[PDB]
Each structure stands twice: as C-alpha cells, then as structure tokens.
C-alpha cells in the first residue's frame, strides 16, 4: 500500500565537524557538543554528535534504523537527523537541543514555568505525534524524558529506537519480549504486547501528567509488577494540583481501555490550542502572570532548522 521513501541519508566526513565539548558519556559511548561545517558552504551548524566506544554488531546494526527513521521524518516538532559518519566507530549527527531534556527542564525551572508554556508544549508534542501518525509510524516510547528542548518555546520528539512502521493493512503491531517502560504503556501494550497510534495517546497522556506535576514520577512508590492490574481495577494517575478539571478530563480520556474511545492526536492539537489562548483559565499556577523563560566564532552560525538540502 505504501509510497517510496525517497528520503536522503547524508554521509558526513569526520573533517567536516568540530567537537567543542562533551555533553555526557556512557558505556554506550560519548555525546559531543560541536559545530558542523559543510565543506565550503560558509555555515556553522550547532550539532550533537553521539558516537560509541566496544561495538557489538548487534549494537551497530540498529543504532542505524534510528538513523533510518530520523532521516525519514521531517517536521518542526521532530528531531531530524543531519547525517551520519562512518568512522571506525559509526557517527550519528543530530540537531543540537541546548536546553536538553524536557523532563529535566521542568524539574530545574519549576519555579519559572507558566501555564502558557505548559499548554504550548502539549500542543507541539501533539503536533509532532500527529505527523508521526500521518507517516504511519508508532513511537512506542513517548515520555517526557524523550522530548527535547530546542528553545523554551520549541520542543521536538526524539528517541525512535523502539519506533515501528505500519503496513497499509496493518492496524496493530505485535511485538516481541524485552525490557519495556511499563508505567508509560497502554494496558493492551502491557498485557498483549500490542501497540498502535492509540497506545501512544495513552503514553501521551502520561507525558502531560509529568509536565503538569513538574516532573513527578508516574505511579511513584508502587511496583510495576502489576500496574496493569490496577489499570484494570479502574485507577489512574491523580489530578495534578495546577490542573483544572478541563485539562485533567483530557488526560483521563487518553487512559481509556477502549483504545478507540481515546482522542486522536489531531484532536488533542485542537483542544490544547483552544486552551492555549486563555492559559490562566485552564491552569492555575501561583505567580503565573509574572513568569519568564529565555557556548563557544558565532558570526556564520546557522541553526539546523534553517539549513535545508
């Protein structure tokens, strides 16, 4: 049923980019802060270079489809892969998201985050996920930890390691066993390993709840060994303090057992953007009307969202 994926995968030279700094390091290798300078194009692009140490051919093999997936997507609210570099240790180059993880940002700036931003972030994630649904794609790991902050007003969806494409006939994806983020998953995902766009809506609901609680742990202090029994018994995450019943009504609908009864991402865009126009009415935060939120040379620097191929 499907159209040809004529997306372009760009192979980069190691001499094409400069490494300024190390953001983080792990057994999975080290992420570098750097600038990408296309040979003779007079442009410097702030990048995140994530490239790994002890490679197993299994590790290599599909660090690569994450790259396959990211190269295929093109949306203002989705992290686009800039290119890869086939060194001794394979190089993956993405757009730099300076403020980093959204989960860490709301924990760090919980004192200076207004209702306007929170509602905006909800819309943008909803837009990004809606683009993913159009591309017949299921993320399978949507969480606040996997939304990156370009600017406080611009966020993008990331971590496509578990993402899967759906065939034209396909409506559900049936997975295989492995370690999974239980407390973000839909009930059918936990029980029958079944995933869908609606299973992302569930996960989308939890992500919002995280933001509204400024980074609280979902079902904190309760063992994951039977989150799914509790979900069957009818219990859900509590209503965040700042949340009007309006906003919390929306989260609850995402946690419906009948996946078809859950809101589509295109509708979540509408409702949250409806509330985004009158923020104070839908999110009660103290000192809300007074809050404001906002590295190496910088003459030829262009952001990746402005550099088109």
């Amino acid at each position: 049923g499907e159209a040809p994926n004529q997306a372009l995968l760009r192979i980069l030279k190691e001499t094409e980019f400069k490494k300024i700094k190390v953001l983080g390091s792990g057994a999975f290798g080290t992420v570098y802060k750097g600038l990408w300078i296309p040979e003779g194009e007079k442009v410097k692009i702030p990048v995140a270079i994530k490239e790994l140490r002890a490679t197993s051919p299994k590790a290599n093999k599909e660090i690569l489809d994450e790259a396959y997936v990211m190269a295929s997507v093109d949306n203002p609210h989705v992290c686009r892969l800039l290119g890869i570099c086939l060194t001794s240790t394979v190089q993956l180059i993405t757009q730099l998201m300076p403020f980093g993880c959204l989960l860490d940002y709301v924990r760090e700036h919980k004192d200076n985050i207004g209702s306007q931003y929170l509602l905006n972030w909800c819309v943008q994630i909803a837009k990004g996920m809606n683009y993913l649904e159009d591309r017949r794609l299921v993320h399978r790991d949507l969480a606040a930890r996997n939304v990156l902050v370009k600017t406080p007003q611009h966020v993008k969806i990331t971590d496509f390691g578990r993402a899967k494409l759906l065939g034209a006939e396909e409506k559900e994806y049936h997975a295989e066993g492995g370690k999974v983020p239980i407390k973000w998953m839909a009930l059918e995902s936990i029980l029958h390993r079944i995933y869908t766009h609606q299973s992302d809506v569930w996960s989308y609901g939890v992500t919002v709840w995280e933001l509204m609680t400024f980074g609280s742990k979902p079902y904190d202090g309760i063992p994951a060994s039977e989150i799914s029994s509790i979900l069957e018994k009818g219990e859900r995450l509590p209503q965040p303090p700042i949340c009007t019943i309006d906003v919390y009504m929306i989260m609850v609908k995402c946690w419906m057992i009948d996946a078809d009864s859950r809101p589509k991402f295109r509708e979540l865009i509408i409702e949250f953007s409806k509330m985004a126009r009158d923020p104070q009415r839908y999110l009660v935060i103290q000192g809300d009307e007074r809050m404001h939120l906002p590295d190496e040379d910088m003459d030829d620097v262009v952001d990746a969202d402005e550099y088109l191929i």
């Binding site: 492995g178 370690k179 999974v180 983020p181 239980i182 407390k183 936990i190 390993r193 994951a224």
Partner: peptide, 7 residues
C-alpha cells in the same frame, strides 16, 4: 531504572 521485565 524504569525499564522492566515483561512476563
């Protein structure tokens, strides 16, 4: 510490 064993 939030990736779990699925039965």
């Amino acid at each position: 510490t939030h990736y779990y064993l699925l039965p």
